[PDB]
Amino acid sequence: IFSHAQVTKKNLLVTMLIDQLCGRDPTLTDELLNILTELTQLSKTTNAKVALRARQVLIASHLPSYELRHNQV
Amino acid sequence: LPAHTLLNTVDVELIYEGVKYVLKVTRQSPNSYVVIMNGSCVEVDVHRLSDGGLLLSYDGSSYTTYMKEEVDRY
Amino acid sequence: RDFTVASPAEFVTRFGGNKVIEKVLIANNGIAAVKCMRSIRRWSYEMFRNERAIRFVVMVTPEDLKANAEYIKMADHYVPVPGGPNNNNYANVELILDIAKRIPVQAVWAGWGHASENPKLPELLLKNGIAFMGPPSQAMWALGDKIASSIVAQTAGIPTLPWSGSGLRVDWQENDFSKRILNVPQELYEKGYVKDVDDGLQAAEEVGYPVMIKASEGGGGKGIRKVNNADDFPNLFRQVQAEVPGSPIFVMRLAKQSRHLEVQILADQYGNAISLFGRDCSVQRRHQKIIEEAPATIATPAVFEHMEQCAVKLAKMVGYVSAGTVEYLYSQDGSFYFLELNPRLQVEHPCTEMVADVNLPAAQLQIAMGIPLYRIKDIRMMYGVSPWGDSPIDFEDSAHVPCPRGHVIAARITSENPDEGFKPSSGTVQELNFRSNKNVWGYFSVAAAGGLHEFADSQFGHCFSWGENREEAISNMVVALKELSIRGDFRTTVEYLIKLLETESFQMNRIDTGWLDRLIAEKVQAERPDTMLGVVCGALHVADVSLRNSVSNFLHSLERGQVLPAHTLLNTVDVELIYEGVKYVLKVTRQSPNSYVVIMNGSCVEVDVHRLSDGGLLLSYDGSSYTTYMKEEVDRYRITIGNKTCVFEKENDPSVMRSPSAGKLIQYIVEDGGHVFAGQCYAEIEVMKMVMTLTAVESGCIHYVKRPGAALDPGCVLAKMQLDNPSKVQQAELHTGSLPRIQSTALRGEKLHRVFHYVLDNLVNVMNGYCLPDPFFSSKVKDWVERLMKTLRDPSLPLLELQDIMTSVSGRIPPNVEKSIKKEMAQYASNITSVLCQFPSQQIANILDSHAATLNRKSEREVFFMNTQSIVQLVQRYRSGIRGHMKAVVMDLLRQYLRVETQFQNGHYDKCVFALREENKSDMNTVLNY
Amino acid sequence: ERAIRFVVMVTPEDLKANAEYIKMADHYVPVPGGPNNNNYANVELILDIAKRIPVQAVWAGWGHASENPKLPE
Amino acid sequence: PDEGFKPSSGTVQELNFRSNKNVWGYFSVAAAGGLHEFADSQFGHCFSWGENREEAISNMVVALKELSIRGDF
Incomplete structure (x- = not known):
């Protein structure tokens, strides 16, 4: 209960820790994928920002990071 | 009970020699307390002693402290 | 008297030092930390007029914090460190350096803890500009293990040695520094250590039979074997070679039973070393010090001065600074042997402080600042020189000036358990009260709140006593120890120390290093109270706990709206206690809230019991009063009477399986006659309509008493088990006698108006439910009635009451009324034994009302009406004379009866109780009393 | 250490307050409480106790009876 | 001493007098227990010895600064 009461502040921390881990490195191992796909399932509106940002990571980590396209083309 | 009767912040008011001081007290950990007055904050390491008192570390110096609450005084 | 210092810098400048110390780290805990901080702060106030001029940093483990260690609150700053064994917190020299540099400190003090035996710490500290309050590492190396120590002692004035491998030595270096280079002494090492099976015998042929071989x-x-024979040496010798395979072994001659003396050495960083004084430390248990004594009174002046000279020569040639101890083995014929140098301050160092008027830890601080000995105040006074000066001292020419003042005994309080050996115990403190006095003091590492944890060593406090001579010091110590109070979960060896100090062999100073071992084998754990008193006291404690629990639970039930029947609020308790194999069975009841009765084998004793706020009981038994405490353990009761302890066993021995509760037996799980193991379920019972199994406690062959399907009572006999009977066979021999009895405080012929109160109060308490058992009730009550009837018909009663109430108030009574009252009561006394004799209640009332008819105003009104109230009460009681008063008393008792018993008519118990509960809403004690 | 026995007079107040002298004494006798004139400044009571419990001496010190010249008589 | 010198009373919570060399003292109440209405002031006495005036003062000052008395009074 106590830790749940400060959910918004925790969400700020969660987003900062996502951006420093899956930022300029669009790759996801099969340990982070489990977390991200679990995190996007928080449907309550209090935890939207984390579920949104996680989604942005998970969907963005399928496009080649512009070196592959440059080289192949 | 709802999750606003289990607060982590306390407002404290204390008058000394006619001067009123208003402070907020919160925690960064079970032992790390933060005292805030007029937008300035100080960190204190607090440990609970078995004898009812508190062991503080404030500005390097440590202290052992005790409080008794009276009807109209601390 | 012109020295004006305020900071350590100025002090160093004035006294000629070279290093300023403002912060000290203590790499220790408990007693050592406490003592260091206290002594140095005293000195700091003396010099700087600031008790906190030197700041102390301590390292705190979570264990010490949770145990509320005493040193924590004293420290200026604390830093947490990892807990557990010493190698994580205090014996980690690299961690010590890390803290010392993290928090900028100028020195480190180690004392007698865990790091002062590690020669690597001074190196690490000196390489970073940090002053260690102790020797340099080169000394601690040269003072290495035992072979090097025995060799190096022989390079100057040679102390005798009992063949430390051999009696061979090296060349002479009387006052030159040298390291233990393995070029010359290697030969000695080759002789000091052995390789083959027959190498050690070459020592045995010279030393004799008592040979000690150690790896x-x-x-x-x-790795230790003691050879007592000549031909059995190869056996135990080869054993030691196998105890630590691959390591070198050494052989030495074993010590005789004689005295262990010590010399305290103190030295500066400029090559000046002095001997302070000695100590006699020959009270040891398994080579552990217990009692120390400061004047070394066994050694004659000549030989003792020789020992001092040898110790100083060793310290000078090796290059030892700050402080240390040299041990000697003193034989009864005036011949000493070198044992070892301890390169650190000892715990028993106050012994030499108190008789030299010095401060050793402060001296260490001043040495660390680079101050020579001839500038430190106390040393200067010790050699008869003005403290406030700078003149040098010729320590060799004035070495006869120092002289001990008095005699000191230091007794250490350990946490061992003299019962069943000396196993270290631990737990929480409930009370720690050391009553100090003139010439007695002491200090502890724990307070009343706090405790001793697993990693917290023994020796949690030290007591010291000074006297002019040996006998006075002993007397002070003995009394002081008998007066202190230590109570907790752990055991506390104090009573044994008392028994030792009262032993004639100690007092006559006829002891040796094997004294206590011999006494231990003779089973000397005495200092027990008398059995009868212990039995009574334990009975009272058990019964009182049971009675208070009954009251509390019953009252709690009443508050919640439940009514329990009136047989769960009992006034009689059965107590069973085994002492030294003898079982005692007693009943305890009450004649009043404070009057208890203990009954055994048809004999009763009365005890006056008062509850103390501290958890104990105040007893009055046979005239003598006692203060007692009890602690209930799993299978024992620990009873403290005064300062003596008695332990009673709680019977759990017969190995009979019993039902823990009421209920019903459904079935048994195993066969009758089958073997059961501990923890296996043997039976199935049901209480509460909810089934509960039953596990066996012991492994054995079970035979069942009750047949399947049976009513179960708590503590009943269900099934016996046959075991192998390890012990506790036939621990019954049920005592069948009678308890002490000589008094009773019946007031037989004492004043007659005190008897009134006595008998009346007993009868009132009967009316309130306090009643003896069957053969005792109406054996004393009839007498109470008869005595009351006789008292109430005696005409002398009311005047006696008047005497007491009038005499208690002499002042604040106008002289007029005072004189009149005295006259009237005298007339009444003159008319005793006359049919017209009547108590002049009206006349007393008349004179008091006359003065009140005058009616002085303004604080002369109220004083008169108030200080005469007792007289008013007395005259009101005897308006109709002794006859009316008698009838009034008896009527009032009958009214008590009706006050209770008219409430429990009209229906069943619970209905009446609910009526009372609903009337007395705001108080449930009233209901309980009914 | 207990060759000379000491009797003390105990009021209910001192008993409830766990006065230190109570535990040290060898014997105690209760007396009436309140001001000093009921318990300790009452010389006649002191005599009454001294004879009721056969004692050979009475020490008063600096309390309340040592300023009353009637007690030695 | 605050607001004059009115006598106070109540329960004791802690009484720890840390004795030392040449210092001692004693009290009429223990940690458990208290001071009641009829219980006079002067519940303890501390004594310190020295060779001269100055040393005795020093001992007394330090010892007083080291003791702990806590209670309602």
């Missing part, structure tokens, strides 16, 4: 890494119960 270079021996210790902790292994």
Whole structure:
């Protein structure tokens, strides 16, 4: 209960820790994928920002990071 | 009970020699307390002693402290 | 008297030092930390007029914090460190350096803890500009293990040695520094250590029968063998070679039973070393010090001065600074042997402080600042020189000036358990009260709140006593120890120390290093109270706990709206206690809230019991009063009477399986006659309509008493089990006698108006439910009635009451009324034994009302009406004379009866109780009383 | 250490307050409480106790009876 | 001493007098227990010895600064 009461502040921390881990490195191992796909399932509106940002990571980590396209083309 | 009767912040008011001081007290950990007055904050390491008192570390110096609450005084 | 210092810098400048110390780290805990901080702060106030001029940093483990260690609150700053064994917190020299540099400190003090035996710490500290309050590492190396120590002692004035491998030595270096280079003494090492099976015999042929063989890494119960024969040497010798395979072994001659003396050495960083004084430390248990004594009174002046000279020569040639101890073995014929140098301050160092008027830890601080000995105040006074000066001292020419003042005994309080050996115990403190007095003091590492944890060593406090001579010091110590109070979960060896100090062999100073071992084998754990008193006291404690629990639970039930029947609020308790194999069975009841009765085998004793706020009981038994405490353990009761302890066993021995509760037996799980193991379920019972199994406690062959399907009572007999009977066979021999009895405080012929109160109060308490058992009730009550009837018909009663109430108030009574009252009561006394004799209640009332008819105003009104109230009460009671008063008393008792019993008519118990509960809403004690 | 026995007079107040002298004494006798004139400044009571419990001496010190010249008589 | 010198009373919570060399003292109440209405002031006495005036003062000052008395009074 106590830790749940400060959910918004925790969400700020969660987003900062996502951006420093899956930022300029669009790759996801099969340990982070489990977390991200679990995190996007928080449907309550209090935890939207984390579920949104996680989604942005998970969907963005399928496009080649512009070196592959440059080289192949 | 709802999750606003289990607060982590306390407002404290204390008058000394006619001067009123208003402070907020919160925690960064079970032992790390933060005292805030007029937008300035100080960190204190607090440990609970078995004898009812508190062991503080404030500005390097440590202290052992005790409080008794009276009807109209601390 | 012109020295004006305020900071350590100025002090160093004035006294000629070279290093300023403002912060000290203590790499220790408990007693050592406490003592260091206290002594140095005293000195700091003396010099700087600031008790906190030197700041102390301590390292705190979570264990010490949770145990509320005493040193924590004293420290200026604390830093947490990892807990557990010493190698994580205090014996980690690299961690010590890390803290010392993290928090900028100028020195480190180690004392007698865990790091002062590690020669690597001074190196690490000196390489970073940090002053260690102790020797340099080169000394601690040269003072290495035992072979090097025995060799190096022989390079100057040679102390005798009992063949430390051999009696061979090296060349002379009387006052020159030298390291233990393995070029010359290697030969000695080759003789000091052995390789083959027959090498050690070459020592045995010269030393004799008592040979001790030890490995270079021996210790902790292994690697040590004591050879008592000549032809059995190869056996135990080869054993030691196998105890630590691959390591070198050494052989030495074993010590005789004689005295262990010590010399305290103190030295500066400029090559000046002095001997302070000695100590006699020959009270040891398994080579552990217990009692120390400061004047070394066994050694004659000549030989003792020689020992001092040898110790100083060793310290000078090796290059020792700050402080240390040299041990000697003193034989009864005036011949000493070198044992070892301890390169650190000892715990028993106050012994030499108190008789030299010095401060050793402060002296260490001043040495660390680079101050020579001839500038430190106390040393200067010790050699008869003005403190406030700078003149040098010729320590060799004035070495006869120092002289001990008095005699000191230091007794250490350990946490061992003299019962069943000396196993270290631990737990919480409930009370710690050391009553100090003139010439007695002491200090502890724990307070009343706090405790001793697993990693917290023994020796949690020290007591010291000074006297002019040996006998006075003993007397002070003995009394002081008998007066202190230590109570907790752990055991506290104090009473044994008392018994030792009262032993004639100690007092006549006829002891040796094997004294206590011999006494231990003779089973000397005495200092027990008398059995009868212990039995009574334990009975009272057990019964009182049971009675208070009954009251509390019953009252709690009443508050919640439940009514329990009136047989769960009992006034009689059965107590069973085994002492020294003898079982005692007693009943305890009450004649009043404070009057208890203990009954055994048809004999009763009365005890006056008062509850103390501290958890104990105040007793009055046979005239004598006692203060007692009880602690209930799993299978024992620990009873403290005064300062003596008695332990009673709680019977659990017959190995009979019993039902823990009421209920019903459904079935048994195993066969009758089958073997059962502990923890296996043997039976199935149901209480509460909810089934509960039953596990066996012991492994054995079970035979069942009750047949399947049976009513179960708590503590009933269900099934016996046959075991192998390890012990506790026939621990009954039920005592069948009678308890003490000589008094009773019946007031037989004492004043007659005190008897009134006595008998009346007993009868009132009967009316309130306090009643003896069957053969005792109406054996004393009839007498109470008869005595009351006789008292109430005696005409002398009311005047006696008047005497007491009038005499208690002499002042604040106008002289007029005072004189009149005295006259009237005298007339009444003159008319005793006359049919017209009547108590002049009206006349007393008349004169008091006359003065009140005058009616002085303004604080002369109220004083008169108030200080005469007792007289008013007395005259009101005897308006109709002794006859009316008698009838009034008896009527009032009958009214008590009706006050209770008219409430329990009209229906059943619970209905009446609910009526009372609903009337007395705001108080449930009233209901309980009914 | 207990060759000379000491009797003390105990009021209910001192008993409830766990006065230190109570535990040290060898014997105690209760007396009436309140001001000093009921318990300790009452010389006649002191005599009454001294004879009721056969004692050979009475020490008063600096309390309340040592300023009353009637007690030695 | 605050607001004059009115006598106070109540329960004791802690009484720890840390004795030392040449210092001692004693009290009429223990940690458990208290001071009641009829219980006079002067519940303890501390004594310190020295060779001269100055040393005795020093001992007394330090010892007083080291003791702990806590209670309602």
